[PDB]
Design an enzyme around this catalytic site. Structure first.
Site, PDB file in Angstrom:
ATOM      1  CB  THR B  12     -70.741  12.658 -10.200  1.00  0.00           C
ATOM      2  OG1 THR B  12     -70.994  14.025 -10.561  1.00  0.00           O
ATOM      3  CG2 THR B  12     -69.655  12.149 -11.071  1.00  0.00           C
ATOM      4  CB  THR B  84     -69.852  16.632  -5.601  1.00  0.00           C
ATOM      5  OG1 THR B  84     -69.771  17.080  -6.968  1.00  0.00           O
ATOM      6  CG2 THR B  84     -69.530  15.165  -5.407  1.00  0.00           C
ATOM      7  CG  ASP B  85     -71.216  20.616  -8.813  1.00  0.00           C
ATOM      8  OD1 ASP B  85     -70.060  21.069  -8.413  1.00  0.00           O
ATOM      9  OD2 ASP B  85     -71.473  20.124  -9.881  1.00  0.00           O
ATOM     10  CE  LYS B 155     -67.280  19.711  -6.696  1.00  0.00           C
ATOM     11  NZ  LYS B 155     -68.240  19.236  -7.704  1.00  0.00           N
ATOM     12  CE1 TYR B 276     -58.823  46.810   6.799  1.00  0.00           C
ATOM     13  CE2 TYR B 276     -59.479  44.885   8.084  1.00  0.00           C
ATOM     14  CZ  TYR B 276     -58.595  45.500   7.192  1.00  0.00           C
ATOM     15  OH  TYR B 276     -57.500  44.816   6.718  1.00  0.00           O
TER      16      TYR B 276
END
Lengths: 329, 329
Positions: B12, B84-85, B155, B276
């Site tokens: 971007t 960014t991804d 992100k 657990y």
């Protein structure tokens, strides 16, 4: 005055610490006793146990929906105690299986067993009871004093008591003692039409995280393994690699036959496959955007939709129908 | 005085809005020009472009690591502009491929193209430059005025400008104009030893979301498709269904040969497979906990680890080695 049903299903809320770890051991009557819940004052609580369970299975959704559906006739409000890890899948799936419920259905759980110091269980049950006494209708989650639309809830953490958020959608309300502050107007949750039960579902949906490296060989493997829907936790760019990569081209080969849904690995703000050219190329292959849906809504909705038809255009129309505010119009 | 290298890679931050959507069009010189970045004052910036790219591929990690590695000799600080991804995958993978870097390596991006109104690009580059001028060493992400350890970044959203968080780990620092407020002591990021380059990796790691319905038939499919590691985004209970379900038993058949890592679909607080009984049963099958690691650290670390050995006990020891504060000791 009012009649409430509390349905137990297992979970941390039903658990106790043992030498082998937390173990689901409590029926709903013991939960209510150990959490010191008042079974009356303007109401009467009845309780029942459905069927050692921490995790819900898709089969359990049909069982729970039938019991909840039969109970709308005899109760003003219905509470379900549930394991936190799969509560949001259940809440979403009931939101598609029970149409136009005419009473509040309120799911809750806890991060701590009742018998652990500082347990959140008593407070979450009490919140759920209070909201269940409201003249409203739909499927809600009660957690850490918040009421959230069921089909918009996700579990965001594994330890903190404020573990559930409303994703890309406002909270319904906040409960402070005996006061309910409506964040969305109460009038917006009035019953409309007669309740209907629809428990058709196809469970063989596989969810993948889109990573660098992920090749089209996975798409071949999941088809060979018999799966009927693919959810991708993709990128905000909304697209896939179509260069040094066969992933997008292998998906384009199957989208006429298999629904491939694009959601996000990111939690917040949804997918917009139109903003980027890479998104538009993914759309052009017939990948179906999940828009602003949660993972848990996307996944259960697709399983429900595949239970109705295997026609991918009809699946697209179902996924993009706003049924119960699971998705923007 | 100081010499900085800015490496462009796409994203971007390199994009412009076109009639076909956002499109990666800018080389690093145009980004710097359009974001009005000062190329001097106590420093000199040099810039270079590695190799239309929005998304990083595992191959690009080796390319970027070699260029960054060669550049430690001639620069005080190194900035990488990035989509960014996949920025957090790159930041994590460089944190394993570049050992004991002796200079700041700072990744950044933007949510908006430079040329869109209110773009975050100028501010993120400026933050990254400021931190890159610090007498520190390691791999950092600069976003929305925060400096975050690279291997702890994820992100979290697709639209909001505050899109990256430090997961289960403190932020390194916050930059307000010309002031750097260290959240972790500066002294903790001093160089130790001589830098080493290690770019061995195996990319065929598949990441699955654990859902109700997920059967052992997927484990068969991913082995048939040639994948060498499986990451599961599982539950905070840390376990799997071993009842109305063959998932846990099919995984137990392969854990001697294939590393199966348990992380969370929830973002925050990590996995504890001991709390657990269901978790302890999952451990007893030889599933390897990711503890407090991010998805992006878990995934890149396993790819790097598989590049070194196919011995599952040795993979367990690598995954649980704290190399660069990607994981608790």
């Amino acid at each position: 005055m009012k009649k409430l049903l509390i349905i137990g299903t297992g979970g941390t809320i039903a658990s106790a610490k043992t030498e082998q770890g937390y173990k689901s051991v409590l029926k709903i009557d013991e939960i209510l006793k150990l959490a010191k819940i008042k079974l009356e004052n303007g109401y009467k609580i009845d309780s029942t146990n459905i069927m050692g369970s921490q995790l819900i299975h898709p089969e359990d959704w049909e069982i729970i929906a039938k019991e909840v559906f039969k109970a709308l006739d005899d109760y003003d409000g219905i509470i379900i105690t549930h394991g936190t890890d799969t509560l949001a899948y259940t809440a979403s799936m009931l939101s598609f299986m029970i149409k136009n419920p005419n009473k509040p259905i309120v799911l809750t759980g806890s991060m701590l067993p009742i018998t652990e110091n500082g347990s959140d269980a008593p407070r979450n049950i009490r919140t759920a009871i209070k909201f269940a006494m409201e003249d409203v209708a739909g499927v809600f989650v009660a957690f850490m004093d918040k009421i959230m639309l069921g089909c918009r809830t996700s579990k965001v953490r594994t330890l903190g008591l404020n573990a559930f958020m409303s994703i890309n959608y406002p909270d319904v309300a906040y409960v402070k003692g005996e006061k309910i502050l409506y964040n969305i107007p109460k009038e917006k949750f009035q019953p409309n039409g007669s309740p209907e039960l629809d428990t058709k579902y196809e469970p063989r949906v596989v969810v993948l995280r889109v990573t660098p490296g992920l090749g089209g060989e996975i798409i071949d493997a999941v088809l060979d393994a018999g799966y009927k829907g693919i959810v991708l936790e993709g990128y905000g760019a909304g697209g896939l690699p179509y260069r040094k990569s066969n992933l997008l081209s292998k998906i384009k080969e199957i989208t006429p036959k298999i629904p491939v849904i694009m959601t996000t690995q990111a939690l917040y703000d949804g997918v917009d496959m139109r903003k980027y050219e890479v998104g538009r190329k993914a759309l052009e292959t017939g990948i179906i955007p999940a828009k602003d849906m949660t993972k848990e809504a996307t996944i259960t909705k697709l399983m429900w939709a595949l239970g109705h038809t295997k026609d991918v255009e009809k699946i697209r129309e179902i996924m993009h129908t706003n049924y119960v505010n699971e998705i923007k119009s």
